[PDB]
């Protein structure tokens, strides 16, 4: 009667497992009116997984984690189902939190506002007649946090816009007011109205489809000639279910409602010696804090991962458009509020691409006739998600020097608020179009690394480039040129709380202090090379800083414990930021050991964005990247057994003349 | 009798012009034994070029700059030839400088050392028998600067290595001593010998060709399946001689012995309004300072551009290997010591590539059926040069959002010195292989921008992201989230001398204070976004800091004057770093105006490298990048008239169901 076991313990729940879980929960709560918010894999404990994979150990139980609401009860209930026995094995009621906002939760808000008499009244005061409510739209946001209601009601705020025609881009025409909606009652409970009213813009909409551009600039550019990419003999990667093998890497590609892509059990086959690198790597939280202090714009600091979910938000991807070439896709499966499985087709795309030169060297002695050149190929595992106005394109990239990179491209549309005719947008925003204020904001991400560098028992350090402390003209530093790398190994959590520093070109190592490279004498490591590391601009004690305690440092290293995934806590919406949970709980008093143990390394990276008119009405892609590169992991360049694109030795060159 | 005029005043000298120039100079110096070091275009004065191009002004004279040596005379002579009249129009003797080391200058050093009795003696003491000198090799370097000789003799230093077989990579087997060679006499004048001798390594060479890898790891990887890129309808760019037009950009692609690629007269056609952006952009100098203080390693700080020349060093590029696709090549032409033209075929490659997504947005309201996606194409203008052990791959990239990026990939081979059996390499280097010490070093580059942002009269600024100065809980910043961009406009040179700062996410604007964006109210600008900006680690007053006065700040802005190209001075080798020339001259007392005038913006960027065994025996490519992006230059995203890869409007989606 139980669902079939998966091919691999880290595989996401199948649609059958989802329905089995929600049947089990409905039965457990029979006679209660409940709705499903989350039904997802509860991954095996790290010890249990490693013991199963590498030690012939017990098969970990297949478990689903659920979150439900119950009509007329505050907060949520959450728990675990054991799928093999179709039973609820753990359950608890959390009356004072609110959970992630699903697509269904968000979907109904527009019609609630269009039909609400107070909202209609504000639209009419703003210059939109009462019988034109079909032209009023809103983007349904998390309320984020509002101290007037805490978590006592489940709330959204509606950022309201106007379209003259359904095909317009509405973001040139924000309205001035902000309805607050009770998600479960489907009712507006309050409208924040500014002391200074600003009526709807009379300008044309700032549009971007070809029909609009033809009107606006006369004509489109002609179709460019095509650039065609083919792989007539197929690809070099091999997938077995969700397990990838490519260029000596092996790893499991997972996916969930919240993080989106989760890469697990990542190893590199070093000439027959299969060496672990990471147990798990993913994006674990975000925050996108805006920088206008005016009310109610403090409530714009979406933690998109915890409040909406990079999986729930993810686009179905298309062949030729989003990622071109020969592509392997994976689907994603979630539950809807009724407990039925839902599918997002082609949620992940996997492909391999040309990546320019891997390495080259030529000898000047025979005018470069002696020459070796080897081209690089990269493997890319990608998704794209839409958070209302913005699109986040995520690319996990594996490379043939053994490095792993995460590239992000931000696109979509600026968040916009209305600007009066004579109103100055600065210093907190930019007038990107008439009557349009695009507020300053940051995009910050929390990369969660559970490392196993060359096996278990790891540490982390900051590496700072420093001049020698001996002065110019000393016997020790006669010409003043000496410099070295100062490695500060983190002994306790408090030591790890560190920022990027340009002054020392700071990087961070994650290494195995139990092992030694036989050439260099240093421990094997992967080094985080990451410079897009903004300070958190919101102050200490701010709503933003309190709700995202991870974001105030570029690096936070804590001891591993099971279920330490989400650093702003498990249920993010409407938390005030007060209390010991998430990263604040894991840091504790800062005194716990993190040298030579099981650690978790959370890195904060991202951008700070001051809008300009180039970003409007649709923003060109803005890049973010970080890299984890092997240093002292190998004893020589690991790509040298890749066949060169061209090689001629000195003796060969001599024979050719 | 004169050479034909070029198609364009910025075109490099043709082979005919080169020979015409060296004939003219030989005639002028008839009865003197002279040799040519440099024969290159003297570009028109900026005012003369702009007046010719945009104002129907005078045709600038076609001029060649030369540098020659004369047997038995110290230093160099330099001057100008007017090509139309075949006459020397300017000449002077500089008895106390030394010029760039050409391929011919460097080529003879190995045989000088193999034949020198003192060198042979040191090879025998180092364990190499006297009859095996054919196995001894050296990389011929600039002496850089040695206070024992100043500029009084023209000198090289030879970094000596040993090969057991001609096809070895010699860098696993450095020897311990350093011969000093008089370039013009072809004689060793001194050998620096360490107090502690280290004999040649007995280990196998660390090799990297397929035949070596088969011995070392058993077998190569099988040939991967191919990834084929075709453009069956040709390319979208158009070249007219050296003038490029692509995606509304127009510019002139020049090339010289020193800088390599020089992009000039760069404009963007904004719907019929052709708007200047830069008059000239290039790399103007480098320095690669090593961080071992031990003698004689202070002399390792090559200024590769000024001391060897990115043009003289440049590789002939090959189709399929270096840059793949449909390619347009340019050749380079220089003079040899006899005054004859020499050609490097396919020195520059030009092509266009897929560059992922340009922009995307989809509407959640119809589950993303309403969707627009436009793919990006980039145009790449590239060269690769070899400086003995290292290869520098340079890519100038134009993009369809109007941004311009410079990407660099470093590859080739670590500089190595010998390490005794029991000798510790740290803190100044790493043991990357037995008996091999790879010293710490930086690679620093000076990007020279002569801007004309939307026309003449420009300024520069630092932009720093800052929290509001009002505290949390104030009426001005109630929730502590307010933040803005503090723009510091540089009024005098001293103001501009600024570093990258992580604490504020610093960027720099180059803008036209005479113009205003009609939406934002800000001046049009291109913003330098650049975070790979190391501090110079060598101390103030060091040889390194004195010879590269530009490298101590990330940004140096000075007034434009003609012939302010090279910031460590015109003749770099063996300058002590004392004296007012190059950037130190241009900075002066720091008081000159640089607000709203003709300015030059020199940016220092690069990396700091602590070797590891992954980099040996051949280093995987290491990336460096910076971007110049339009901000408040356009009134909206300039790529919106590119045909989308996919577009469906809301009304279209409604009709499709």
Curated annotation (Swiss-Prot), chains A, B:
Which PROSITE patterns does its entry note?
COPPER_AMINE_OXID_1, COPPER_AMINE_OXID_2
Q: Which domain of life is it from?
A: Eukaryota
Explain the post-translational modification.
Answer: Topaquinone (TPQ) is generated by copper-dependent autoxidation of a specific tyrosyl residue.
What does the induction field say? By methylamine.
Presence of the UniProt keyword Glycoprotein in the record:
yes
* Co-factor(s): Cu cation; Zn(2+); L-topaquinone; Mn(2+)
Q: How is the cofactor bound?
A: Binds 1 copper ion per subunit. Can also use zinc ion as cofactor. Contains 1 topaquinone per subunit.
Q: Where is the active site?
A: 304, 390
Q: Name the residues that bind substrate.
A: 302-313, 387-392
Which residues in this protein are found as 2',4',5'-topaquinone?
390
Residues at which Mn(2+) binds: 450, 598-599
Under Pfam families, the record lists:
Cu_amine_oxid, Cu_amine_oxidN2, Cu_amine_oxidN3
Q: Where does Cu cation bind?
A: 441, 443, 609
From the record, give the cysteines joined by S-S bonds: 323-349
Q: Where is this protein found? A: Peroxisome
Q: Name one GO cellular component term.
A: peroxisome
| Catalytic reaction annotation | a primary methyl amine + O2 + H2O = an aldehyde + H2O2 + NH4(+)
Q: Which GO terms describe its molecular function?
A: copper ion binding; primary methylamine oxidase activity; quinone binding
Its GO biological process annotations read: amine metabolic process
The protein's UniProt keywords, in alphabetical order, are:
Copper, Disulfide bond, Glycoprotein, Manganese, Metal-binding, Oxidoreductase, Peroxisome, TPQ
The glycosylation sites annotated in the UniProt record are 228
Enzyme Commission number(s) of this protein: 1.4.3.21
Which family is it part of?
Answer: Belongs to the copper/topaquinone oxidase family.
Oligomer status and interactors: Homodimer.
Q: What is this protein called?
A: Peroxisomal primary amine oxidase
């Amino acid at each position: 009667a139980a669902p079939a076991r998966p091919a691999h313990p880290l595989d996401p729940l199948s649609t059958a497992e989802i329905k089995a879980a929600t049947n089990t929960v409905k039965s457990y709560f029979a006679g209660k009116k409940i709705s499903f918010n989350t039904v997802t894999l509860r991954e095996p404990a790290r010890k249990a997984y490693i013991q199963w994979k590498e030690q012939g150990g017990p098969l970990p139980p297949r478990l689903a984690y659920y979150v439900i609401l119950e009509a007329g009860k505050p907060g949520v209930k959450e728990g675990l189902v054991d799928l093999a026995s179709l039973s609820v094995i753990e359950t608890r009621a959390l009356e004072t939190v609110q959970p992630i906002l699903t697509v269904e939760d968000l979907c109904s808000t527009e019609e609630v506002i269009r039909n609400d008499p107070a909202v209609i009244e504000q639209c009419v005061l703003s210059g939109i007649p009462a019988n034109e409510m079909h032209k009023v739209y809103c983007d349904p946001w998390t309320i984020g946090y509002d101290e007037r209601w805490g978590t006592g009601k489940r709330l959204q705020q509606a950022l309201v816009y106007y379209r003259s025609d359904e095909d317009d881009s509405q973001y040139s025409h924000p309205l001035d007011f902000c309805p607050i909606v009770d998600t479960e009652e489907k009712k507006v409970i309050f409208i924040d109205i500014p002391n200074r009213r600003r009526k709807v813009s009379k300008h044309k909409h700032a549009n971007f489809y070809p029909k609009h551009m033809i009107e606006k600039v006369g004509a489109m550019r002609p179709e460019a000639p095509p650039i065609n990419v083919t792989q007539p003999e197929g690809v070099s990667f091999k997938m077995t279910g969700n397990v990838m093998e490519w260029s000596n890497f092996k790893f499991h590609i997972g996916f969930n409602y919240r993080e989106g892509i989760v890469l697990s059990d990542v190893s590199y086959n070093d000439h027959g010696n299969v060496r672990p690198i990471f147990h798990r790597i993913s994006l674990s939280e975000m925050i996108v804090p805006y920088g206008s202090p005016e009310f109610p714009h403090q409530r714009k600091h979406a933690l998109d991962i915890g409040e909406y979910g990079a999986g729930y938000m993810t686009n179905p991807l298309s062949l030729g458009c989003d990622c071109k070439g020969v592509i392997h896709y994976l689907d994603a499966h979630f539950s809807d509020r009724a407990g039925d499985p839902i599918t997002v087709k082609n949620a992940v795309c996997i492909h391999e691409e040309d990546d320019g030169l891997l390495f080259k060297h030529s000898d000047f002695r025979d005018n470069f006739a002696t020459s070796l050149v080897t081209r690089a190929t990269k493997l890319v595992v990608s998704q794209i998600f839409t958070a209302a106005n913005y699109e986040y394109c995520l690319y996990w990239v594996f490379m043939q020097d053994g490095a792993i990179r995460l590239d992000i491209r931000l696109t979509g549309i600026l968040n916009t608020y209305i600007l009066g005719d004579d109103e100055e947008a600065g210093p907190w925003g930019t007038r990107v179009y008439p009557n349009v204020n695009a507020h300053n904001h940051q995009h910050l991400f929390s990369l969660r690394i559970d490392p196993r560098i060359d096996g278990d028992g790891n540490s982390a350090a900051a590496c700072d480039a420093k001049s020698s402390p001996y002065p110019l003209g000393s016997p020790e530093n006669m010409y003043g040129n000496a410099f070295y790398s100062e490695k500060t190994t983190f002994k306790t959590v408090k030591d790890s709380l560190t920022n990027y520093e340009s002054a020392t070109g700071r990087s961070w190592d994650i290494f195995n202090p139990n092992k030694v490279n036989p050439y260099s004498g240093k421990p094997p490591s992967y080094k985080l090379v990451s410079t897009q590391c903004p300070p958190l601009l919101a102050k200490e004690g701010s709503l933003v800083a309190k709700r995202a305690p991870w974001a105030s440092h570029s690096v936070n290293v804590v001891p591993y414990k099971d279920n330490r995934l989400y650093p702003s806590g498990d249920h993010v919406p409407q938390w005030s930021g007060d209390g010991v949970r998430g990263m604040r709980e894991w840091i504790g008093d800062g005194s716990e050991n993190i040298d030579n143990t099981d650690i978790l390394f959370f890195h904060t990276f991202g951008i700070t964005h001051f809008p300009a008119p180039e970003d409007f009405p649709l923003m060109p892609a803005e890049p973010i990247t970080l890299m984890l590169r092997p240093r002292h992991f190998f004893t020589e360049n690991p790509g040298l057994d890749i066949q060169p694109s061209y090689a001629m030795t000195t003796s060969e060159a001599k024979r050719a003349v």
